[PDB]
């Protein structure tokens, strides 16, 4: 089990002003640290956030959090469930800021809610340094869904923070699962505009080089993986289903497929594959599904005969091509479940 610690700096808060926090299981024989960012959509104005507070309150408040959680998938300490990093120090950071991990704005007489996701990550890192992170060799910042996009928005800031604090031996890397989306045309509500409005409501922040390319008022571009990834300096491994259910939902696709929809789905897969061509560390199976890394059976899927735990191990070796140890694994078959190992 991982144990809850509420942040000692109680001014770094969830949406409703309650303290943010993290769950930790230490492994004193290991110099590897895995920090995982939870996902769960976002909210972008007062009325939309009020609705989320009624029926998704654990994503906005720590008032009802449990004292422990079980680590699963890449967060499991059992070698059989986690061939990759079972002996690592494990951290789960709950998502309670509703801002895709981008916000830097406190609750005030002008703000009903606080949006502090970017500050929560930096405060977790600072407080872990006294619990053993100061001795680390690798810090892997991982996340799924909105947490996967959060990795892309925050990995370089973590690297910069540790350098400025005086810890140049810690190698910071990212793993972004199910957070690589396209700002495409819908098959038949305005998903890209919701991000633009959210950034203004949250005081959202994006990585510096990407901000400088797109300039004032265009920071929404940096929430899309294919636009922000080329600007990043830290190594980042990308995991993305070619036919992600969240992408299909925002595209208004709900699955006897006729020709128009067949062509739409085939084109989506081809576009996603194109965006990954210059991503050297990636795992992209031709399946209709969502999320991958914290489920217990994450070991089952394979691309070209290689599982995700193997690909991540090969990535570790490459950061010290390798014979029989590939790191770029993107399916080329053009329809969901053309890969026989897709989740059932
Ligand atoms: O038919 C299958 C089914 C594979 C499969 C089906 C479900 C799984 O969960 C899984 O891990 C693998 O095998 C593949 C070939 C194959 C499978 C595993 C390998 O390690 C390999 O190198 C090739 C085929 O299409 O011929
Ligand atoms: O990944 C997203 C959001 C994706 C998104 C993608 C493109 C956009 O322009 C945009 O505004 C949002 O939400 C997921 C949740 C989810 C969405 C749809 C599903 O079918 C699902 O099973 C889970 C999360 O953070 O848990
Ligand atoms: O290419 C193959 C199989 C090749 C193959 C070649 C020789 C074998 O002995 C064998 O078992 C399998 O299957 C793929 C489907 C596929 C199977 C397993 C995968 O991990 C995958 O990513 C795609 C296809 O037809 O596009
Ligand atoms: C607590 O966090 C706030 C906001 O991030 C910061 O301004 C403040 O200096 C922090 N307090 C301490 C003691 O570090």
């Amino acid at each position: 089990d991982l144990r809850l610690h509420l942040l000692l700096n109680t001014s770094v808060t969830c949406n409703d002003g309650s303290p943010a926090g993290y769950y930790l299981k230490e492994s004193r024989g290991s110099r590897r640290w895995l920090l995982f960012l939870e996902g769960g959509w976002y909210c972008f104005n007062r009325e939309n956030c009020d609705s989320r507070y009624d029926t998704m309150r654990r994503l906005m408040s720590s008032r009802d959090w449990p004292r422990t959680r079980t680590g699963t998938g890449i967060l499991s300490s059992q070698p059989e469930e986690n061939p990759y990093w079972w002996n690592a120090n494990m951290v789960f950071i709950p998502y309670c800021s509703s801002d895709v991990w981008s916000g830097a704005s406190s609750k005030s007489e002008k703000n009903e809610y606080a949006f502090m996701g970017a500050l929560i990550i930096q405060e977790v890192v600072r407080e872990l340094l006294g619990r053993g992170l100061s001795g680390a060799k690798v810090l892997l910042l991982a996340g799924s869904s909105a947490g996967g996009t959060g990795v892309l928005l925050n990995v370089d800031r973590v690297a910069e923070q540790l350098e400025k604090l005086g810890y140049p031996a810690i190698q910071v890397r990212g793993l972004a699962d199910s957070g690589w989306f396209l700002d495409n045309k819908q098959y038949r509500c305005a998903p890209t505009e919701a991000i633009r409005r959210g950034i203004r409501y949250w005081n959202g922040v994006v990585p510096e080089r990407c901000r400088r390319q797109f300039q004032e008022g265009e920071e929404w571009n940096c929430f899309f993986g294919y636009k922000v990834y080329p600007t990043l300096r830290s190594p980042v491994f990308v995991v993305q289903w070619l036919f992600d259910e969240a992408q299909l939902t925002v595209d208004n696709v709900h699955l006897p497929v006729q020709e128009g929809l067949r062509l739409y789905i085939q084109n989506l897969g081809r576009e996603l594959r194109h965006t990954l061509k210059d991503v050297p560390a990636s795992f992209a199976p031709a399946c209709l599904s969502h999320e991958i890394i914290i489920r217990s059976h994450w070991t089952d899927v394979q691309v070209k005969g290689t599982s995700l735990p193997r690909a991540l191990h090969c990535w570790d070796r490459s950061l010290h091509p390798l014979k029989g140890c590939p790191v770029h694994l993107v399916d080329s078959c053009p329809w969901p479940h053309c890969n026989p190992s897709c989740p059932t």
Side-chain angles (χ1 to χ4, degrees):
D1 284 335
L2 281 67
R3 297 194 308 104
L4 176 59
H5 301 265
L6 296 176
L7 292 181
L8 295 171
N9 184 341
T10 55
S11 79
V12 178
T13 72
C14 299
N15 288 133
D16 69 353
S18 61
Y22 62 91
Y23 292 79
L24 169 65
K25 177 176 167 296
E26 286 196 46
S27 183
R28 289 161 181 86
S30 174
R31 299 212 140 202
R32 294 174 206 258
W33 286 73
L34 213 212
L35 278 61
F36 180 88
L37 306 178
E38 183 186 24
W41 288 114
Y42 58 89
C43 66
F44 62 89
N45 62 38
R46 170 69 179 272
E47 297 78 19
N48 186 251
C49 293
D50 284 351
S51 174
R52 185 181 174 88
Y53 200 74
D54 270 317
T55 63
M56 310 190 80
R57 188 175 290 185
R58 286 169 291 175
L59 298 177
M60 298 188 68
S61 181
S62 62
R63 70 201 294 182
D64 302 317
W65 287 356
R67 312 315 216 276
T68 60
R69 289 183 64 112
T70 305
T72 57
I74 202 173
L75 287 166
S76 175
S77 299
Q78 305 172 24
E80 297 77 18
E81 182 164 333
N82 182 5
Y84 174 53
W85 266 29
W86 62 268
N87 204 34
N89 295 272
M90 304 297 191
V91 180
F92 179 89
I93 312 181
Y95 180 40
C96 68
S97 52
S98 308
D99 58 3
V100 201
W101 298 94
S102 78
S105 171
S106 311
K107 186 168 161 57
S108 74
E109 96 168 358
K110 184 168 46 66
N111 301 324
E112 172 81 345
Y113 295 111
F115 299 99
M116 306 189 72
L119 300 170
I120 289 164
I121 294 167
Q122 306 287 123
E123 184 66 26
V124 172
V125 169
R126 260 178 302 202
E127 300 188 15
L128 289 172
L129 285 166
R131 292 180 167 267
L133 182 64
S134 56
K137 287 310 130 193
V138 183
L139 189 175
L140 178 58
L141 181 70
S144 298
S145 306
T149 309
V151 171
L152 300 175
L153 296 170
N154 288 279
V155 65
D156 280 6
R157 186 168 305 112
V158 175
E160 176 186 7
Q161 172 196 13
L162 290 174
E163 290 167 24
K164 289 184 185 180
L165 285 170
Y167 298 98
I170 304 175
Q171 299 184 54
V172 178
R173 310 174 178 170
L175 167 57
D177 170 31
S178 300
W180 186 275
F181 296 107
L182 304 180
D183 51 341
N184 67 341
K185 196 176 205 175
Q186 295 176 316
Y187 173 65
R188 287 201 178 89
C189 184
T192 313
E193 177 61 17
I195 293 295
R196 299 186 188 101
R197 289 225 262 153
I199 292 169
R200 307 184 200 108
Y201 190 51
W202 308 328
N203 189 39
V205 299
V206 300
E208 175 199 281
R209 183 170 294 98
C210 190
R211 179 175 65 245
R212 289 179 175 175
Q213 291 180 2
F214 288 100
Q215 302 190 310
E216 60 96 2
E218 298 293 325
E219 298 86 2
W220 70 267
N221 285 279
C222 299
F223 283 64
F224 289 84
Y226 77 97
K227 301 187 207 189
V228 65
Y229 172 96
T231 74
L232 298 179
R233 292 324 159 214
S234 301
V236 175
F237 192 112
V238 176
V239 178
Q240 186 66 38
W241 306 113
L242 295 177
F243 309 100
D244 186 281
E245 285 175 352
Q247 180 77 55
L248 288 172
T249 294
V250 304
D251 285 331
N252 290 323
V253 171
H254 306 292
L255 297 163
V257 176
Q258 308 213 259
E259 181 179 352
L261 183 56
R262 170 172 72 251
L263 295 171
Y264 185 94
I265 289 169
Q266 288 175 332
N267 184 65
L268 172 66
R270 282 194 312 267
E271 286 176 336
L272 210 61
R273 183 176 150 79
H274 180 255
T275 64
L276 295 174
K277 184 181 303 182
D278 300 334
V279 180
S282 52
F283 188 87
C287 311
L288 172 58
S289 188
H290 184 65
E291 198 214 64
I292 185 181
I293 65 176
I294 60 170
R295 80 184 186 285
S296 293
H297 296 94
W298 77 302
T299 51
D300 291 350
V301 177
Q302 300 172 1
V303 172
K304 297 182 166 75
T306 300
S307 73
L308 177 61
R310 176 155 185 80
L312 292 168
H313 157 71
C314 301
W315 182 50
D316 282 15
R317 283 185 59 199
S318 80
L319 294 171
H320 295 165
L322 305 169
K323 185 177 184 178
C325 215
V327 309
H328 180 87
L329 294 163
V330 178
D331 268 327
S332 60
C333 62
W335 195 258
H337 225 319
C338 60
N339 183 326
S341 75
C342 289
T344 89

